[PDB]
Design an enzyme around this catalytic site. Structure first.
Site, mmCIF file in Angstrom:
data_model
loop_
_atom_site.group_PDB
_atom_site.id
_atom_site.type_symbol
_atom_site.label_atom_id
_atom_site.label_comp_id
_atom_site.label_asym_id
_atom_site.label_seq_id
_atom_site.Cartn_x
_atom_site.Cartn_y
_atom_site.Cartn_z
ATOM 1 N N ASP A 116 5.372 -3.694 -11.949
ATOM 2 C CA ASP A 116 4.672 -3.280 -10.736
ATOM 3 C C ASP A 116 4.591 -4.515 -9.846
ATOM 4 O O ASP A 116 3.855 -5.460 -10.154
ATOM 5 C CB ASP A 116 3.286 -2.727 -11.085
ATOM 6 C CG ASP A 116 2.376 -2.523 -9.871
ATOM 7 O OD1 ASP A 116 2.816 -2.632 -8.708
ATOM 8 O OD2 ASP A 116 1.179 -2.248 -10.097
ATOM 9 N N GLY A 149 0.758 -1.236 0.000
ATOM 10 C CA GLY A 149 0.000 0.000 0.000
ATOM 11 C C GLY A 149 0.792 1.292 0.000
ATOM 12 O O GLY A 149 0.325 2.275 0.583
ATOM 13 N N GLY A 155 3.077 3.080 -2.998
ATOM 14 C CA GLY A 155 2.970 3.966 -4.148
ATOM 15 C C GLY A 155 3.004 3.365 -5.540
ATOM 16 O O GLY A 155 3.013 4.120 -6.518
ATOM 17 N N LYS A 156 3.028 2.038 -5.666
ATOM 18 C CA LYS A 156 3.364 1.432 -6.951
ATOM 19 C C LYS A 156 2.286 1.699 -7.992
ATOM 20 O O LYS A 156 2.577 2.129 -9.112
ATOM 21 C CB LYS A 156 3.564 -0.072 -6.788
ATOM 22 C CG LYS A 156 4.866 -0.453 -6.131
ATOM 23 C CD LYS A 156 4.607 -0.825 -4.691
ATOM 24 C CE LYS A 156 5.875 -1.187 -3.973
ATOM 25 N NZ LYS A 156 5.580 -1.617 -2.588
ATOM 26 N N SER A 157 1.028 1.434 -7.640
ATOM 27 C CA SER A 157 -0.057 1.622 -8.596
ATOM 28 C C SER A 157 -0.207 3.093 -8.957
ATOM 29 O O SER A 157 -0.500 3.439 -10.107
ATOM 30 C CB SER A 157 -1.362 1.065 -8.024
ATOM 31 O OG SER A 157 -2.485 1.542 -8.744
ATOM 32 N N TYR A 158 -0.006 3.978 -7.980
ATOM 33 C CA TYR A 158 -0.085 5.406 -8.255
ATOM 34 C C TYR A 158 1.061 5.854 -9.151
ATOM 35 O O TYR A 158 0.857 6.617 -10.102
ATOM 36 C CB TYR A 158 -0.088 6.187 -6.939
ATOM 37 C CG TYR A 158 0.227 7.660 -7.077
ATOM 38 C CD1 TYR A 158 1.512 8.145 -6.865
ATOM 39 C CD2 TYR A 158 -0.765 8.568 -7.416
ATOM 40 C CE1 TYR A 158 1.797 9.489 -6.994
ATOM 41 C CE2 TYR A 158 -0.489 9.915 -7.543
ATOM 42 C CZ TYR A 158 0.793 10.370 -7.329
ATOM 43 O OH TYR A 158 1.076 11.710 -7.456
ATOM 44 N N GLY A 177 3.586 -5.559 -2.875
ATOM 45 C CA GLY A 177 4.481 -5.285 -1.771
ATOM 46 C C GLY A 177 4.381 -6.313 -0.661
ATOM 47 O O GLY A 177 3.428 -7.084 -0.558
HETATM 48 N N1 LIG Z 1 2.278 10.152 -3.834
HETATM 49 C C1 LIG Z 1 0.960 9.956 -3.762
HETATM 50 N N2 LIG Z 1 0.138 11.017 -3.929
HETATM 51 C C2 LIG Z 1 -1.183 10.825 -3.859
HETATM 52 N N3 LIG Z 1 -1.854 9.692 -3.639
HETATM 53 C C3 LIG Z 1 -1.017 8.660 -3.479
HETATM 54 C C4 LIG Z 1 0.366 8.701 -3.525
HETATM 55 N N4 LIG Z 1 0.903 7.440 -3.316
HETATM 56 C C5 LIG Z 1 -0.151 6.678 -3.150
HETATM 57 N N5 LIG Z 1 -1.344 7.347 -3.240
HETATM 58 C C6 LIG Z 1 -2.680 6.783 -3.100
HETATM 59 O O1 LIG Z 1 -2.716 6.034 -1.899
HETATM 60 C C7 LIG Z 1 -3.299 4.734 -2.129
HETATM 61 C C8 LIG Z 1 -2.245 3.671 -1.944
HETATM 62 O O2 LIG Z 1 -1.378 3.667 -3.089
HETATM 63 P P1 LIG Z 1 -1.277 2.413 -4.040
HETATM 64 O O3 LIG Z 1 -0.504 2.815 -5.235
HETATM 65 O O4 LIG Z 1 -2.649 1.799 -4.332
HETATM 66 O O5 LIG Z 1 -0.481 1.339 -3.202
HETATM 67 P P2 LIG Z 1 0.193 0.179 -3.984
HETATM 68 O O6 LIG Z 1 1.463 0.680 -4.579
HETATM 69 O O7 LIG Z 1 -0.762 -0.308 -5.112
HETATM 70 N N6 LIG Z 1 0.527 -1.087 -2.944
HETATM 71 P P3 LIG Z 1 0.306 -2.575 -3.708
HETATM 72 O O8 LIG Z 1 -0.582 -2.393 -4.896
HETATM 73 O O9 LIG Z 1 -0.364 -3.583 -2.698
HETATM 74 O O10 LIG Z 1 1.709 -3.141 -4.167
HETATM 75 C C9 LIG Z 1 -3.936 4.801 -3.512
HETATM 76 O O11 LIG Z 1 -5.299 5.204 -3.430
HETATM 77 C C10 LIG Z 1 -3.072 5.835 -4.237
HETATM 78 O O12 LIG Z 1 -3.805 6.531 -5.237
HETATM 79 MG MG LIG Z 2 -0.925 -2.211 -6.797
#
Ligand SMILES: Nc1ncnc2c1ncn2[C@@H]1O[C@H](COP(=O)(O)OP(=O)(O)NP(=O)(O)O)[C@@H](O)[C@H]1O
Ligand SMILES: [Mg+2]
Ligand SMILES: CC(=O)O[C@H]1C(=O)[C@@]2(C)[C@H]([C@H](OC(=O)c3ccccc3)[C@]3(O)C[C@H](OC(=O)[C@H](O)[C@@H](NC(=O)c4ccccc4)c4ccccc4)C(C)=C1C3(C)C)[C@]1(OC(C)=O)CO[C@@H]1C[C@@H]2O
Ligand SMILES: Nc1nc2c(ncn2[C@@H]2O[C@H](COP(=O)(O)OP(=O)(O)OP(=O)(O)O)[C@@H](O)[C@H]2O)c(=O)[nH]1
Ligand SMILES: Nc1nc2c(ncn2[C@@H]2O[C@H](COP(=O)(O)OP(=O)(O)O)[C@@H](O)[C@H]2O)c(=O)[nH]1
Ligand SMILES: [Mg+2]
Lengths: 432, 451, 386, 38
Positions: free
Chosen positions: C245, C97, C99-102, C248
């Protein structure tokens, strides 16, 4: 209640399984017709590990018999313990593989695999708590190697959480009985390294050497080889059946013996072995079993442990004996042979003790080693493989059945990578 | 049901079939009239092995045989012989003249109007069979019928059945001895069919068998009966793996999987070790090592060729009787240390082993001694090239002047089926020369990267 | 060329705001500082990376990095490397959770899109702008996921089977029967991206409502051709752009997983642990032979212990130029985990690739010999011997 | 009038070019090393 499903493939696997079912059946006290005629109360306490219970107080072993040539099946039925197996588990076809791994894995076995998996599913559904499987077959042959690898792949696809054991008879340097053993062995080892938790290495050369040098037999046949192997299989899984001071499940052995996932090729051994002439001379005690287990000439894989290092070892004793003596002897073996054990696994000796010995002995022990010397065996096969693949000695038989050079190349590369992964830990002095 | 259909073509084929079927009838306790009193005395069993014999309702056993020839004489000898009631009455014998040492006469002119009936009866036999393993075709090079009609029949069988194995036992012309002036032409013209269609061809020589009979069995004046009996023993040793139980059983597919590295080099030699007279059966142990060593002696070969001049490419040993694996292993191990026996560097294993419990039988009136152990060796080597080369030379010496050619062209052929065959022989010899060469030194020329 | 390293810190989420919201991550220039919340007396441990990014506050200008900022800094550079004819990769790392998907994908409906859409749009703009009579371009797409040691294809329609991983002797690992789709315009690849993101396996946990359950690899095969009827060679360059991607690492206590959600997580952790080893292993080797003497005796890298490391054999090391984007969490409670990422990131820059990239080895040999002839002829002409 | 036919040989242009360029490189190098320019 832990219990095991048993699968047999090929001539070698079928015969070893028949002998194994004769040995286990004694320990538990089972008539050839299926009735129980034991004397001890602890024989029936955990009989469900191997045997289903029938209506008329009979016991049917949980075995699956697989082949493509019907003849071996007949040899099982027309035997001392032929009637013990249920007829529904005799799965076979016609027009055997003919020592062609392609026929066993791709063309012929692809049709019988469905029926074999049907019977396996039927046996496994009735299980109270299925622990794992074990397969007996020969890598250097035809139907055995191919169908064993295919069944292993399918079962790991369908039962990922269960243990998948294997007892394999591989080629030897001097003892050879088929011209195309290297191809089958290479492809089989490529299939086994991915889809298996434990794999015990057995070589005919080592068993003949044990028979001639230790047991002093003059005219050994395959019966004696099956006897030794079946003794090993009964030794491995003693602790699921009988009580002990310190138990050792199959998962305990898997966890304690495997440091990394791809290094799960074990060297088995058994003690005592006395030749029936020197039985009155030697005293039987824990130090004698310890000395015989770690002796180089007692191993069943024809790989000298002195040419490498012991990544791990496991010792399963059977009999009434003191734990202090066992621990002291294992520590002494570690300390004296300081150069044959790895320097980053302190106390790399698993110990197990069971209170019920075999029927005719006061004490016994089984040894399961995991050492780098096994690399030698693979290297040998790889050498022979190149000697035929560079000129494509017999490749048209395999390519005619729906394969290509790419599978051979990737199998050879995987074998070489495994051989490199053992050596890494083989040399001493990890710094430079 | 490991069924095998036997086909016999020509006089040599029919006589070898007589010997073979005598041995088969004796092996399973079948009387000449087809009855088996053994089951009646016992009560029942599987002794009517479906490899060779088919059992009808009334307890009679009909062999799975197909005899063919163009002369009425050779098979009329069988229709009114000891075994007249054993065979089915249909014997496929053209009441006309014969190929007359003429490949063209047997392939084009007279081979027609008899091939259809033969194929029909082969189909009828194949329909009764479940899990048919393959065919065993007996014939002889140098004869008109055994060359031309064998070529036609093999072509049609390859067209129809295709995937079933087709083994070949043929009598090659000897280097010196011969019984016809036009042997080389008929022998050379059969290369296309013996190569493109057959899966494994076993060649035997009458001179070699005469030498074996004179030296081992101490028969100074042998006839064709002894040769046919020896060949029958060879074929029985080959086929015993799918009739009787044994420690290691070798099917007809393991044969081809182990013995032929490439499709075009399927010409292995054969030999039988314990060929010994009754008087000399004593004073000898006849252990596994002795027979296994005798299999490799050049004097005991069934074709006039020296294995020392070539290299062994594959070997298949088939043991019968009171034999155990460890003696065989010791024999192979001590053989591998001899420098007179050379194996190609690209076949480091080089051995296939099979063991059968049934010991060999003794035909009354025969000359082979009763023994406890026996072994038949089939060896794919490169010395066989010599056996072609001599014959090739002979062919040239007749084709330079177009001698005896008008007989061949007067029946349907032209001269080009006479050159094409020669070129095919040359290509086959080049292939055999090329395969036996050692791998080039460090076959990746040389190697060694940084580290 | 050493591996490029980017790090990025995200803002607080609901879980952080509900619990203690003490920040610990600070950034200045190329330097990222982490402070132990349990030991304020201790040194403020800090790491120097190639790039660091502060996305905690958007109004301010304290080295604030929007999506376009990180895209210019890393993705545009790596795309320019791709145009020169180099196989190229960018892969994400961190914890659950973060930053990867973002970072890689972003929110499509918003302007804050991830690296993959912006790289694809810029690539399409550049191929359309620079098109000429002689120059020509072609592009092809594929997108796979690793769920539990099994490869599945997303762009393809519903295929319940699992693809087979194979090894070409010269080109290394690949995935057999992978739907490689031809595309011609930015809208079509955008549609493919949307379908692929829909097809992925996603499940909700305590740490994140949209916790990813499977690693993902997005591959773009680009072909650059120059046509000439006299001397030039067509298909001058071929490049592979790989955006990865990774799911985590998770902890069962905080994640709250049970049953299937637990088992999936276990596999994910396995697929990460091996990866860490590989990175560490690789680093030491490419640190050792480079710095120690030059021995190059023998060093084993456990590529085969997982399918993820197996497929990325050429990406983590060898014949590609690679960038690693680490995602951080500013929460104090996450410190013992967050530092771990930085440590591997601190080792990630040590890794050094070996990328040259050619095509048609017959043309390679011919060009080498022709260049040698031209050089020798020029030397002879200059010295009066021509 | 049966006469020798020999084998009609048509070499690959790629192999011909590679061999010719290698020979040219060798010749030019032997020329340059000779005039002490290498
Ligand atoms: N730098 C950022 N600025 C704004 N929103 C962010 C940022 N990083 C993450 N988010 C948001 O916070 C949430 C968590 O980020 P997310 O990218 O889904 O985690 P993740 O990388 O997918 N972890 P995972 O998918 O389990 O490997 C999402 O709703 C994103 O849109
Ligand atoms: Mg993801
Ligand atoms: C002690 C005595 O008076 O007789 C012994 C005996 O002499 C020795 C030599 C036995 C004997 O073993 C052999 O001779 C032998 C030959 C070929 C291959 C393997 C063994 C024995 O045959 C073997 C036999 O073994 C058993 O009975 C075990 O329970 C054994 N089960 C079977 O052998 C068995 C075989 C067929 C059907 C039913 C049981 C066993 C071993 C391990 C795990 C479970 C069971 C035993 C004790 C003996 C004899 C009879 C001489 C030994 O074997 C075993 C496994 O005990 C040889 O090494 C031991 C040492 C024993 O002293
Ligand atoms: N070993 C052995 N060889 C035989 C026997 N009979 C014939 N031959 C061989 O066969 C060759 C002659 O060709 P045949 O096979 O008899 O020709 P055919 O089958 O009669 O056909 P036609 O020529 O048309 O009459 C001789 O050179 C012999 O070597 C036999 O009984 N035993
Ligand atoms: N230990 C042991 N090995 C055997 C036995 N029978 C055959 N083998 C080995 O198995 C190999 C032949 O494999 P095979 O059983 O024919 O494989 P299959 O054709 O697929 O059934 C040989 O190399 C033998 O060494 C046996 O009874 N015991
Ligand atoms: Mg005749």
């Amino acid at each position: 209640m832990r219990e095991i499903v048993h699968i047999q493939a090929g001539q070698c696997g079928n015969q070893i399984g028949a002998k194994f079912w004769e040995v286990i059946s004694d320990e538990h006290g089972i008539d050839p017709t299926g009735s129980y005629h034991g004397d001890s109360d602890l024989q029936l306490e955990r009989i469900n590990v191997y045997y289903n219970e029938a209506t008329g107080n009979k016991y049917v072993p949980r075995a699956i018999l697989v082949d493509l040539e019907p003849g071996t099946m007949d040899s099982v039925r027309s035997g001392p313990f032929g009637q013990i197996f249920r007829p529904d588990n005799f799965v076979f076809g016609q027009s055997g593989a003919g020592n062609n791994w392609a026929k066993g894995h791709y063309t012929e076995g692809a049709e019988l695999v469905d029926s074999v998996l049907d019977v396996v599913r039927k046996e496994s559904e009735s299980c109270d708590c299925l622990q794992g499987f074990q397969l007996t077959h020969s890598l250097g042959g035809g139907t055995g190697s191919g169908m064993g690898t295919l069944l292993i792949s399918k079962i790991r696809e369908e039962y990922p959480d269960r243990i998948m054991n294997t007892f394999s008879v591989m080629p030897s340097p001097k003892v050879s009985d088929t011209v195309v053993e290297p191809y089958n062995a290479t492809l089989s080892v490529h299939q086994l390294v991915e889809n298996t938790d434990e794999t015990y290495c057995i070589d005919n050369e080592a068993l003949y050497d044990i028979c001639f040098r230790t047991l002093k037999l003059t005219t050994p046949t395959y019966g004696d080889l099956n006897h030794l192997v079946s003794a090993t299989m009964s030794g491995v899984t003693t602790c699921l059946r009988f009580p002990g001071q310190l138990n050792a499940d199959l998962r305990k052995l898997a966890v304690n013996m495997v440091p990394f996932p791809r290094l799960h090729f074990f060297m088995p051994g058994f003690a005592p072995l006395t030749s029936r002439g020197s039985q009155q001379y030697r005293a039987l005690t824990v130090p004698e079993l310890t000395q015989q287990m770690f002796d180089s000439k007692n191993m069943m894989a024809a790989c000298d442990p002195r040419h490498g290092r012991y990544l791990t070892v496991a010792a399963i004793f059977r009999g009434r004996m003191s734990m202090k003596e066992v621990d002291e002897q294992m520590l002494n073996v570690q300390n004296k042979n300081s150069s044959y054990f790895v320097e980053w696994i302190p106390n790399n000796v698993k110990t197990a003790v069971c209170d019920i010995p075999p029927r005719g002995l006061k004490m016994s022990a089984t040894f399961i080693g995991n050492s780098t010397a096994i690399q030698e065996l693979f290297k040998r096969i790889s050498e022979q493989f190149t000697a035929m693949f560079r000129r494509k000695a017999f490749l048209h038989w395999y390519t005619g059945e729906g394969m290509d050079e790419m599978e051979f190349t990737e199998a050879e590369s995987n074998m070489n990578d495994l051989v490199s992964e053992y050596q890494q830990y083989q040399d001493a002095t990890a710094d430079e | 049901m490991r069924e095998c259909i036997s086909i016999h073509v020509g006089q040599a084929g029919v006589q070898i079939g007589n010997a073979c079927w005598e041995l088969y009838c004796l092996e399973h306790g079948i009387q000449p009239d087809g009855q088996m009193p053994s089951d009646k005395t016992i009560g029942g069993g599987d002794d009517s092995f479906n490899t060779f014999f088919s059992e009808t309702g009334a307890g009679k056993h009909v062999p799975r045989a197909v005899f063919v020839d163009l002369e009425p004489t050779v098979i009329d000898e069988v229709r009114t012989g000891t075994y007249r009631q054993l065979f089915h009455p249909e014997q496929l014998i053209t009441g006309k003249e014969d190929a007359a040492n003429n490949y063209a006469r047997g392939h084009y002119t007279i081979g027609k109007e008899i091939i259809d009936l033969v194929l029909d009866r082969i189909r009828k036999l194949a329909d009764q069979c479940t899990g048919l393993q393959g065919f065993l075709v007996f014939h002889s090079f140098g004869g008109g019928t055994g060359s031309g009609f064998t070529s036609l029949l093999m072509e049609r069988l390859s067209v129809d059945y295709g995937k079933k194995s087709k083994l070949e036992f043929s009598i090659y012309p000897a280097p010196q001895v011969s019984t016809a002036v036009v042997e080389p032409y008929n022998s050379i013209l059969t290369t296309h069919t013996t190569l493109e269609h057959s899966d494994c061809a076993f060649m035997v020589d009458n001179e070699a068998i005469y030498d074996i009979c004179r030296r081992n069995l101490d028969i100074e004046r042998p006839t064709y009966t002894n040769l046919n009996r020896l060949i029958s023993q060879i074929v029985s040793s080959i086929t015993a793996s799918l009739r009787f139980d044994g420690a290691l059983n070798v099917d007809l597919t393991e044969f081809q999987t182990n013995l032929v590295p490439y499709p075009r080099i399927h010409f292995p030699l054969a030999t039988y070790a314990p060929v010994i007279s009754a008087e000399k059966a004593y004073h000898e142990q006849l252990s596994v090592a002795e027979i296994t060593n005798a299999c490799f002696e050049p004097a005991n070969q069934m074709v006039k060729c020296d294995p020392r001049h070539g290299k062994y490419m594959a070997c298949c040993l088939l043991y019968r009787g009171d034999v155990v694996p460890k003696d065989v292993n010791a024999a192979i191990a001590t053989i591998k240390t001899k420098r007179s026996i050379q194996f190609v560097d690209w076949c480091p294993t080089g051995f296939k082993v099979g063991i059968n419990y049934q010991p060999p039988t003794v035909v009354p009136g025969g000359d082979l001694a009763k023994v406890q152990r026996a072994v038949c060796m089939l060896s794919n080597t490169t010395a066989i090239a010599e056996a072609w080369a001599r014959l090739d030379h002979k062919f040239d010496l007749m084709y330079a002047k177009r001698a005896f050619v008008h007989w061949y062209v007067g029946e349907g052929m032209e001269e080009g089926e006479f050159s094409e065959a020669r070129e095919d022989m040359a290509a086959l010899e080049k292939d055999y020369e090329e395969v036996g060469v050692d791998s080039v030194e460090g076959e990746g020329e040389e190697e060694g990267e940084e580290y | 060329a050493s591996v490029k390293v980017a790090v990025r810190v995200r803002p607080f989420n609901s879980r952080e705001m509900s619990r203690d919201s003490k920040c610990i991550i600070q950034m200045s220039g190329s330097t990222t500082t982490i402070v132990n919340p349990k030991q304020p007396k201790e040194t403020p441990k800090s790491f120097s990376f190639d790039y660091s990014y502060w996305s905690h506050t958007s109004p301010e200008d304290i080295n604030y990095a929007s999506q376009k900022q990180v895209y210019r800094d890393i993705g545009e550079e790596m795309l320019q490397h791709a145009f020169e004819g180099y196989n190229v990769c960018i892969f994400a790392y961190g914890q659950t959770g973060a930053g990867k998907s973002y970072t890689m994908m972003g929110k499509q409906e918003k302007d804050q899109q991830g690296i993959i859409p912006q790289l694809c749009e810029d690539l399409f703009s550049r191929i359309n702008d620079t098109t000429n009579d002689n120059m020509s371009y072609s592009v092809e797409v594929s997108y796979m996921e690793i769920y539990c040691e099994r490869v599945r294809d997303l762009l393809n329609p519903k295929n319940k089977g699992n693809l087979r991983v194979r090894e070409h002797p010269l080109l290394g690992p690949y995935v057999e029967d992978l739907s490689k789709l031809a595309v011609t315009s930015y809208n079509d690849i955008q549609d493919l991206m949307d379908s692929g993101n829909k097809a992925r396996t996603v499940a909700a946990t305590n740490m994140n409502e949209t916790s990813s359950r499977s690693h993902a690899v997005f591959n773009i095969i680009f072909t650059q051709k120059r046509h000439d009827a006299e001397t030039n060679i067509t298909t001058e360059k071929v490049s592979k752009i790989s955006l990865v991607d990774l799911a985590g690492s998770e902890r069962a206590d905080s994640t709250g997983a049970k049953g299937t959600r637990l088992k999936e997580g276990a596999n994910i952790n396995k697929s990460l642990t091996t990866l860490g080893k590989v990175i560490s292993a690789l680093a030491e080797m490419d640190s050792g032979p480079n710095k120690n003497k030059k021995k190059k005796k023998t060093d084993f890298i456990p590529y085969r212990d997982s399918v993820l490391t197996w497929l990325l054999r050429e990406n983590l090391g060898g014949n590609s130029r690679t960038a690693m984007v680490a995602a951080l969490s500013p929460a104090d409670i996450n410190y013992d985990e967050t530092l771990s990422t930085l440590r591997y990131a601190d080792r990630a820059k040590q890794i050094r690739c070996n990328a040259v990239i050619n095509e048609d080895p017959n043309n390679k040999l011919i060009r080498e010999l022709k260049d040698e002839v031209t050089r020798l002829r020029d030397l002879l002409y200059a010295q009066g011997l021509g």
